[PDB]
Amino acid sequence: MREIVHIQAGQCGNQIGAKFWEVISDEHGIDPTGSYHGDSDLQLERINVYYNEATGNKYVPRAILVDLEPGTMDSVRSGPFGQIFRPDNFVFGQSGAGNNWAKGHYTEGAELVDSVLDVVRKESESCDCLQGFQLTHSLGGGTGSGMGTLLISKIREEYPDRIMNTFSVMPSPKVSDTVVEPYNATLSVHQLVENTDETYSIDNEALYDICFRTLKLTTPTYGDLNHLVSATMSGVTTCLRFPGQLNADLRKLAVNMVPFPRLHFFMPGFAPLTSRGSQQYRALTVPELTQQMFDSKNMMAACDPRHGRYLTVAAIFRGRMSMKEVDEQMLNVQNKNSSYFVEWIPNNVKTAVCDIPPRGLKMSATFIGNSTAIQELFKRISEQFTAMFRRKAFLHWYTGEGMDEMEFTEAESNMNDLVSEYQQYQDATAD
Amino acid sequence: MRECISIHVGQAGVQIGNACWELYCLEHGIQPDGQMPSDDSFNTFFSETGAGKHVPRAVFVDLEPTVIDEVRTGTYRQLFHPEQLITGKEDAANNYARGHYTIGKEIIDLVLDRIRKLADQCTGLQGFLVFHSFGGGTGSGFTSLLMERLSVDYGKKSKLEFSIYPAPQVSTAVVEPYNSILTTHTTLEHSDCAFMVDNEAIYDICRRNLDIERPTYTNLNRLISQIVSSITASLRFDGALNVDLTEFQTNLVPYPRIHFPLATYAPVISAEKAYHEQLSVAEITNACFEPANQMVKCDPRHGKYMACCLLYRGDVVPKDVNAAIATIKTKRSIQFVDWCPTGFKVGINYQPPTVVPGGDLAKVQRAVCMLSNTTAIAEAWARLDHKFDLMYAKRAFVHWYVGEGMEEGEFSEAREDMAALEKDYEEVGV
Amino acid sequence: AESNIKVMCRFRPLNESEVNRGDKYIAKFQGEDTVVIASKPYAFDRVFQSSTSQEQVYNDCAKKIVKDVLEGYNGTIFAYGQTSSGKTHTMEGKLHDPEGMGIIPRIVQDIFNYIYSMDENLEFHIKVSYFEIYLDKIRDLLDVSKTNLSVHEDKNRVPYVKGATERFVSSPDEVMDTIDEGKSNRHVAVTNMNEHSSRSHSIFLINVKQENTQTEQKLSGKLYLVDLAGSEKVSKTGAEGAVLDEAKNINKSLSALGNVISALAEGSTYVPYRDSKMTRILQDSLGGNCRTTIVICCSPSSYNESETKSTLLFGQRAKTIKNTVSVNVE
Ligand SMILES: Nc1nc2c(ncn2[C@@H]2O[C@H](COP(=O)(O)OP(=O)(O)OP(=O)(O)O)[C@@H](O)[C@H]2O)c(=O)[nH]1
Ligand SMILES: Nc1ncnc2c1ncn2[C@@H]1O[C@H](COP(=O)(O)OP(=O)(O)OP(=O)(O)O)[C@@H](O)[C@H]1O
Ligand SMILES: Nc1nc2c(ncn2[C@@H]2O[C@H](COP(=O)(O)OP(=O)(O)O)[C@@H](O)[C@H]2O)c(=O)[nH]1
Numbered sequence A: 001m002r003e004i005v006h007i008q009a010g011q012c013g014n015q016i017g018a019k020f021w022e023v024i025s026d027e028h029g030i031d032p033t034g035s036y037h038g039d040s041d042l043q044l045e046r047i048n049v050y051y052n053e054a055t056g057n058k059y060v061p062r063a064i065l066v067d068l069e070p071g072t073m074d075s076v077r078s079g080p081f082g083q084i085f086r087p088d089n090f091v092f093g094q095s096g097a098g099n100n101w102a103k104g105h106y107t108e109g110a111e112l113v114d115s116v117l118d119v120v121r122k123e124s125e126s127c128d129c130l131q132g133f134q135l136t137h138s139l140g141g142g143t144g145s146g147m148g149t150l151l152i153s154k155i156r157e158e159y160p161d162r163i164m165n166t167f168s169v170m171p172s173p174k175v176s177d178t179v180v181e182p183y184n185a186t187l188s189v190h191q192l193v194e195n196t197d198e199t200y201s202i203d204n205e206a207l208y209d210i211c212f213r214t215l216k217l218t219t220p221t222y223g224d225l226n227h228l229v230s231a232t233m234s235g236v237t238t239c240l241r242f243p244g245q246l247n248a249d250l251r252k253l254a255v256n257m258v259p260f261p262r263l264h265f266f267m268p269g270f271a272p273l274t275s276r277g278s279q280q281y282r283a284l285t286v287p288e289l290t291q292q293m294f295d296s297k298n299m300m301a302a303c304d305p306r307h308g309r310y311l312t313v314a315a316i317f318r319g320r321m322s323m324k325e326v327d328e329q330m331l332n333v334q335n336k337n338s339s340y341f342v343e344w345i346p347n348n349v350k351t352a353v354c355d356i357p358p359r360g361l362k363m364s365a366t367f368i369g370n371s372t373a374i375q376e377l378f379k380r381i382s383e384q385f386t387a388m389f390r391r392k393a394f395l396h397w398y399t400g401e402g403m404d405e406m407e408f409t410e411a412e413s414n415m416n417d418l419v420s421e422y423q424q425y426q427d428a429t430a431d
Numbered sequence B: 001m002r003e004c005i006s007i008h009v010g011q012a013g014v015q016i017g018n019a020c021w022e023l024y025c026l027e028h029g030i031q032p033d034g035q036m037p038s039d040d041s042f043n044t045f046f047s048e049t050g051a052g053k054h055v056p057r058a059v060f061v062d063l064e065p066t067v068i069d070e071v072r073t074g075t076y077r078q079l080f081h082p083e084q085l086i087t088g089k090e091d092a093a094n095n096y097a098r099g100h101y102t103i104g105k106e107i108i109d110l111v112l113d114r115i116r117k118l119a120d121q122c123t124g125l126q127g128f129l130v131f132h133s134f135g136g137g138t139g140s141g142f143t144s145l146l147m148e149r150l151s152v153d154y155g156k157k158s159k160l161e162f163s164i165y166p167a168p169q170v171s172t173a174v175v176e177p178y179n180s181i182l183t184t185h186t187t188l189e190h191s192d193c194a195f196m197v198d199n200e201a202i203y204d205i206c207r208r209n210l211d212i213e214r215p216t217y218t219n220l221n222r223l224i225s226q227i228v229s230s231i232t233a234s235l236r237f238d239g240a241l242n243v244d245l246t247e248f249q250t251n252l253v254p255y256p257r258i259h260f261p262l263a264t265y266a267p268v269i270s271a272e273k274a275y276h277e278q279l280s281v282a283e284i285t286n287a288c289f290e291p292a293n294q295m296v297k298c299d300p301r302h303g304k305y306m307a308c309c310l311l312y313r314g315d316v317v318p319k320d321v322n323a324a325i326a327t328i329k330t331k332r333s334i335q336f337v338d339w340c341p342t343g344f345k346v347g348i349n350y351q352p353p354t355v356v357p358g359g360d361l362a363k364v365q366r367a368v369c370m371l372s373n374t375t376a377i378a379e380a381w382a383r384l385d386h387k388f389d390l391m392y393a394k395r396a397f398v399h400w401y402v403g404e405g406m407e408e409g410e411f412s413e414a415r416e417d418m419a420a421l422e423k424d425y426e427e428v429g430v
Numbered sequence C: 001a002e003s004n005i006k007v008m009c010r011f012r013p014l015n016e017s018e019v020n021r022g023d024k025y026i027a028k029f030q031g032e033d034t035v036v037i038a039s040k041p042y043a044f045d046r047v048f049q050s051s052t053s054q055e056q057v058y059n060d061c062a063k064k065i066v067k068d069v070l071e072g073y074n075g076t077i078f079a080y081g082q083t084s085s086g087k088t089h090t091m092e093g094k095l096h097d098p099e100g101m102g103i104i105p106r107i108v109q110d111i112f113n114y115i116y117s118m119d120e121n122l123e124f125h126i127k128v129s130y131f132e133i134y135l136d137k138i139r140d141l142l143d144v145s146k147t148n149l150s151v152h153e154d155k156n157r158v159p160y161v162k163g164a165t166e167r168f169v170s171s172p173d174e175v176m177d178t179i180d181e182g183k184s185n186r187h188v189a190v191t192n193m194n195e196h197s198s199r200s201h202s203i204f205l206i207n208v209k210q211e212n213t214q215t216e217q218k219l220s221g222k223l224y225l226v227d228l229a230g231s232e233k234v235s236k237t238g239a240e241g242a243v244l245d246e247a248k249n250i251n252k253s254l255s256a257l258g259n260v261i262s263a264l265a266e267g268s269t270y271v272p273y274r275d276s277k278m279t280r281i282l283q284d285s286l287g288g289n290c291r292t293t294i295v296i297c298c299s300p301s302s303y304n305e306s307e308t309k310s311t312l313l314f315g316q317r318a319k320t321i322k323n324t325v326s327v328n329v330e
């Protein structure tokens, strides 16, 4: 299907989202004045998938940007591609919810929610063959978390037929200055499991370790990290943006990824990220790519799948190459590393190849895994959540912003049913 | 007179189409716009139009626009007439119930009308060649819906399939054991005779018989198209008999449920292997009983031959054919049907095959394709039902199909007939 | 402590569309326990052959569950089976005819007939709600305003429906009015299988509370009476457009009910009550503190043989299930 509507929410969600758009906009050959410079004819091909044809020779992204704190929209607006976003589509408040999911979901954000809905209806009814909606938000802040999930549910009540794609970023156990993040997380997961088609779980923890070990960088600076996010986020959108081989859309992705409809939390990964400029050595070819793509060291969630099995892998290759060598390299890997897949799911590895690569490279490979090990993440949030909840610590800051305690009980109740679910299909066998 | 229409459903389906149509174009002498320096047996699969443009007896169908927009962007875009190129928008997306229920019915009338306006320009229409996967969204779902509606619409007029089969090494989708069993279940009663294409076999033959190290699906379709051109050669060249699709049905079926033959094609030799380049009619007839060159990569060392037709094209003499067939009947440990005598139907067309200008095969003086009904493909069904059972046991992925219009009973019913297809393949033999 | 799910089997007659097609009568019966279909026996709690009246279904199926629910157990009665097979006839029926009325208003009366037969020291507070699951959202039936309702978890986390019309009823006659109102608000369409086809799963809940003033003890019981929709083959019903959207959600929710039934019978480690809103509202009903009777509803026409067979195997599966039954305090 054709048009995706993209929605960015919270400080992160709008910064990783602008970094996404400058990546796909360079791929589709469009500049910060909104001019199509594309040197290949194929750059304009499926342009209307992400883009709106505006008045005249201007292509504008079908992106809606939401925040309560208006300085986020200013850093986007004063960012390098600022003018490419339509200033109707800057949706801004004047406060900020303040790492409080409740002030997101019930206070400030439920005041803002309807201003947003009016602009996603407007992107929507303007689309010819609408695919569905793509939200980028946090599972840990204040804007992205409660106001995101308010969004997920509100648009989905309006459009339950089309696809709900989300890039949901997960908070780190190592860093963050914000203590209450597992509270915001548990509360979000509860809404997410009920209202998304697919959830890419984007762990800050892993992005940190991917950037610190692989690429090289020491303290966490979000502009360097957001490059690895944006490169992943280009990677999986490839098949929607550009033609090649199998799995064009998100539905044929999600249909092939999800065995049981609440298990839609996917583990991202990206290849090549080797020693820049110099290597030029070490790795180059499609099996070397397939290797890096399959590696626990190249995974973007902090759950080591060497400790919890894979259900399904969707692998998006980019460049001109051999469909046979992927068929064999996906055969090989699944034969040999069989004990890290699940026996009851036959044919575990799903492959797309697009002729177009990204810029900076000639060949690339993106991993998307529906892994049972994503439970270690739901356990980390829980064990932390239930820690604070049993002493009813910080609770008053949230219950005071509208919530019942029984909403903390219910949000926990589904996260732990989600845990039993993920623990089952780790443990399960054939017959 | 004796005209046939190719209906190309699915991305694979469509890209074997491309290669087939491009190959018929070169075969006939047809320039890539339409004009041709000559005339002759373009008759069946092409129609000459007023302005000298020779138009395919085609229908191309895709459930999004992308596969078909590459057609009308590239080469032969001016050969392919816009009415015969049919796009969708919101696809089935690997999901059989979207292709049968939800999205499929949204193009079905429209595909049938452009089929009917092409068929009503067929003086002696034989029937259809539908090319589709047993495994995809488009290919699996839209084709089974299309088969039911064509059995009501054209009835007596034949439906041949060229059907893409997944394999126990080379596979594609997770839900593909459902796609397969679901589609077959529907096709069984409706279809006529189906030439299973195993994508592993083609991949494997290209590696071992064609010495290709890096093949792409372009390379694979080049071998595929060469078996489809070999079958269709009987309508399109000069020669002896077998000029009709129904002789294929008639002579290949042991019982009509068991309507799925195996095709061999020979020689599958690379242009680069020009040392032992002088192959005989015997040589290429040996290769047709060789387990290498089987388009369906199952074990003929377990499975019995039930029925064989040999189609020779190029510099082949039928003295040479007789001699070949007698000695292949003495040499190979081939089990055969009891109720009938010895089973070979032989076709001889005088004109060699064609390669594409970059084509991988050698430009051989003679060629053969064997169409053969084997019990070997019950081995392949058995692997497929055992995968259905795995997934169905846990109920995995089934919410996406039942949640897009399907009943779970349909899975039970489908599997029950596939398990009776298993018993039909057991019972021919005892 | 552990009581099986009673799985009870009802065959209707051959309807007009069936007899005018010329369809065979495929049901053979062996005693009260077993139905034989294509020589194959399918074994149950009680089987009801075609001639069974609406009263007959009431005294054998329904009757005893009335005394148990008012002993402060929860009680679930629900009908399952493909389209036209006689679920709505069974549960609703023809409400105002004293022969044609079904389980729901017959349950209501025998509740109040029990309350008429009780001492002056038992106070009873009965509240009812009536809602439907239509296009996977919970529409309130007694109120037009609420188009989706919410699933909340209770005191010991057992789920219940928040945001509903809880009408507090005095007479059974007034309960017949909330039934009559809610029935006619319930979303019904003409299909080629049924002219009054249920397109939604309809959820009547009677929550009955009682205290004896003199004993000073309080008990509650949730009585759920679900007329389900019947998972249908698109070939048969001829469903396109909205009829299909409807069908999708129904097939979707009853595959999930099936999988929950299935998981319980095999002893699978999760038990996904969390798939559908129907499976959630049925959490107590399928493994919890309720005495649950499943009425599997069947057609005897040859046309539906395959899908009839499946409905019987759902019930053989289902009979194997026990509930974790207990007395519900207040
Ligand atoms: N032989 C052949 N197979 C191909 C071709 N390109 C892709 N395939 C494969 O054939 C199978 C795909 O079948 P399709 O019929 O394309 O599946 P489809 O119906 O397009 O699937 P959807 O996109 O879900 O609708 C997969 O195993 C592909 O790898 C091709 O040109 N020739
Ligand atoms: N046991 C029966 N005895 C006599 N008539 C019956 C019986 N069961 C059903 N019928 C007839 O069939 C008709 C339709 O039955 P009903 O609506 O209950 O089917 P249903 O199973 O609810 O269908 P759906 O799944 O579409 O809702 C009834 O209105 C009634 O007249
Ligand atoms: N990758 C990444 N994560 C960030 C960034 N900024 C903050 N984070 C973290 O990711 C989540 C962002 O939440 P957000 O919704 O942006 O917080 P809010 O805008 O302040 O409500 C939090 O858990 C932050 O610690 C960023 O630019 N990139």
Ligand SMILES: [Mg+2]
Binding pocket: C087, C088, C089, C196, C197, C198, C227, C228, C229
């Ligand atoms: Mg009904």
